[PDB]
From a paper:
As a proof-of-principle, we generated two dHax3 variants, dHax3-NI, in which Ile34 was introduced at repeat 7 to replace Ser34 for recognition of base A, and dTALE (standing for designed [name] repeats), in which the RVDs in repeats 3–12 were replaced and the protein recognize an artificial DNA element (5′-TCCAACTACTAGA-3′). Two structures were determined for DNA-bound dHax3-NI at 2.8 Å and 2.2 Å, respectively. The structure of dTALE in complex with the target DNA element was refined at 2.4 Å resolution. The structures of DNA-bound dTALE can be superimposed to dHax3 with an RMSD (root-mean-squared deviation) of 0.946 Å over 455 Cα atoms with the major deviation occurring to the amino (N) terminal helix. Similarly, structural comparison of DNA-bound dHax3 and PthXo1 reveals an RMSD of 1.04 Å over 429 Cα atoms. These observations corroborated the notion that DNA binding by [name] repeats is modular and context free. While the coordination of base A by Ile34 is almost identical in the structures of dHax3-NI and PthXo1, the binding of base G by dTALE shows some subtle but important difference. In the PthXo1-DNA complex structure, Asn34 is hydrogen-bonded (H-bonded) to the N7 atom of base G; in the high-resolution structure of dTALE, however, the side group of Asn34 donates a H-bond to O6 atom of G. Given that O6 atom is more electronegative than N7 atom in base G, the H-bond with O6 atom may represent a stronger interaction. Asn34 form the hydrogen bond in a different way with both A and G. The length of the hydrogen bonds are about 3 Å.
Transcription activator-like ([name]) effectors specifically bind to double stranded (ds) DNA through a central domain of tandem repeats. Each [name] effector ([name]) repeat comprises 33–35 amino acids and recognizes one specific DNA base through a highly variable residue at a fixed position in the repeat. The crystal structures of [name] effector ([name]) proteins bound to their respective target DNAs have revealed that the residue at position 13 is the only one directly involved in DNA base recognition, whereas the 12th residue stabilizes the proper loop conformation. dHax3, an engineered [name] protein, proved to be a useful scaffold for structural characterizations. We then present fifteen crystal structures of engineered dHax3 variants in complex with target DNA molecules, which elucidate the structural basis for the recognition of bases adenine (A) and guanine (G) by reported or uncharacterized [name] codes.
Author numbering: 233 to 722
Write the structure that this text describes.
DNA sequence: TGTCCAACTACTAGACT
DNA sequence: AGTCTAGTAGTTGGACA
């Protein structure tokens, strides 16, 4: 457009920084980048309609809806259907927003309103499963296709409805389901794959792409390259599986002969989301790291054998220098922090925060390492920094207790939950912070603390035989699943 | 461009042994 | 205790108004 039109845009944008959404710059950048110009003007236009009854959406909910292709249509449609969906279909507001927060949002909402009753009633699905189906790019297409094919996939193919729901609940779910219908016999008969294995391949974005690529490339990979089919499955059962498989074919020689790696290793690098990026990056850096960084092949393999493997490997080559030299951690400690999904992130946050955390909070490099060295390390590091102060002082914990709660997967979630529940658990139900610490000092610390507090709030008679000191042991032994499974058995 | 649909890459969390 | 797996965010490409 023209300069005048720009200025209006920048001005409707500015009006959004105030009432009633009070959007910040990050949020406006999200809407512009993901929902486009129209999405931004739409939000501005309907802002009072959306933040008031009967919608009562949050500024964050409005953003999640707007930030997609067609956002404006999702927003328009959301104001039309949310009340009917919540009131007449039992859906919650969060659920309607989850359905709305994907490209084609408007088509998915209208289709749920139309098909939810038939899906739940004539195929025994729950509202929770209809929502998981609808809540992808293309949701309308997945929903209509489950309606057409769920009977034949079950009768003529022996899949369970759960399996048909898992196949449908991805972007491209319509494609995945028609493909499974097509190739499930062939892949089992001609290739010796179990139905369960076809389902695993099909249950990711581009599931159709992966099934077709398995049907093609499986022979060459097995017969020529010698791979087991089970290893071909494992490669394919990931986002962008077809790219993984194409890439293994190409690089399986150049990596097993030139760089000496074993087929067993190349498979482990491919069997993750973005496995193609992983392989090509190992190809390109194995010499560079095993000569100018003193890193063994095995270490390189372990670094690359996780989703985002390419990101971690490049982040290692770039920071193994400084982190050792300027901070002091051994190639062992750097290889550990990188050896997780999101490894690149944990590495950059340890670049940043090793000094601040030690200087302002008194932590060791060894502690810092222990916190960065889990999936989502970045998120635990940034939360220790943030909350360790209040946790130690408002809540009477030690710095080391705080490190222990941070030192598992979901450390960020475990920390925030303690700062939320620790009060009621000691005050209301008189629980020693030593107990609460130990329930949270495990993976799944968040849900286990939520589960235990549900019980001490509204006791189910199903758990009567278990004293509170027992519930704590269970929560510590196996967390939520341990509480939920004890409930199941009466 | 705007909208819908599909597919790929990466990150974060909880769970299963 | 390292792992396997689901959930999801962010982005890109094809297709067609």
């Amino acid at each position: 457009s023209g300069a005048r039109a720009l200025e209006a845009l920048l001005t409707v944008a500015g009006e959004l920084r105030g009432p009633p959404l009070q959007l910040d710059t990050g949020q406006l950048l999200k809407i512009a980048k993901r929902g486009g110009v129209t999405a931004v003007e739409a939000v501005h236009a309907w802002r009072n309609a959306l933040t008031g009854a009967p919608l009562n959406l949050t500024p964050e909910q409005v953003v999640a809806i707007a930030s997609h292709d067609g956002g404006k249509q999702a927003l328009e449609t959301v104001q039309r259907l949310l009340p009917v969906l919540c009131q007449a279909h039992g859906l919650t507001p969060q659920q309607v927003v989850a359905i709305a927060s994907h490209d084609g949002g408007k088509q998915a909402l209208e289709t749920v309103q139309r098909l939810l009753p038939v899906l739940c009633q004539a195929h025994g699905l729950t509202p929770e499963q209809v929502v998981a189906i609808a809540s992808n790019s293309g949701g309308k297409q997945a929903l209509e296709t489950v309606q057409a094919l769920l009977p034949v996939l079950c009768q003529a193919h022996g899949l369970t409805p759960e399996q048909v729901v898992a196949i449908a609940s991805n972007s491209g779910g319509k494609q995945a389901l028609e493909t499974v219908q097509r190739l499930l016999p062939v892949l089992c008969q001609a290739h010796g794959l179990t139905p369960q294995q076809v389902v695993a391949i099909a249950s990711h974005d581009g599931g159709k792409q992966a099934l077709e690529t398995v049907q093609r490339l499986l022979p060459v990979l097995c017969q020529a390259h010698g791979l087991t089919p089970q290893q071909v499955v494992a490669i394919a059962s990931n986002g962008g599986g077809k790219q993984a498989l194409e890439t293994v074919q190409r690089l399986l020689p150049v990596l097993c002969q030139a760089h000496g790696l074993t087929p067993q290793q190349v498979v482990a690098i491919a069997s993750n989301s973005g496995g193609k990026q992983a392989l090509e990056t190992v190809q390109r850096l194995l010499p560079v790291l095993c000569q100018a960084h003193g890193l063994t092949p095995q270490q390189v393999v372990a670094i690359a054998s996780h989703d985002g493997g390419k990101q971690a490997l490049e982040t290692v080559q770039r920071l193994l220098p400084v982190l050792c030299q300027a901070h002091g951690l051994t190639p062992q400690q750097v290889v550990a922090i990188a050896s997780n999904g999101g490894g690149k992130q944990a590495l950059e946050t340890v670049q940043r925060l090793l000094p601040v955390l030690c200087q302002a909070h008194g932590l060791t490099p060894e502690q810092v390492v222990a916190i960065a060295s889990n999936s989502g390390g970045k998120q635990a590091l940034e939360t220790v920094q943030r909350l360790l102060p209040v946790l130690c002082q408002a809540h009477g914990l030690t710095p080391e207790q705080v490190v222990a709660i941070a030192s598992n997967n979901g450390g960020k979630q475990a920390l925030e939950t303690v700062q939320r529940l620790l009060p009621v658990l000691c005050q209301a139900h008189g629980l020693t912070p030593q107990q609460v610490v130990a329930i949270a000092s495990n993976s799944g610390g968040r849900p286990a603390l939520e589960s235990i507090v549900a019980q001490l709030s509204r006791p189910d008679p199903a758990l009567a035989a278990l004293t509170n000191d027992h519930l704590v042991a269970l929560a510590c032994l196996g967390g939520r699943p341990a509480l939920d499974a004890v409930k199941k058995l009466e």
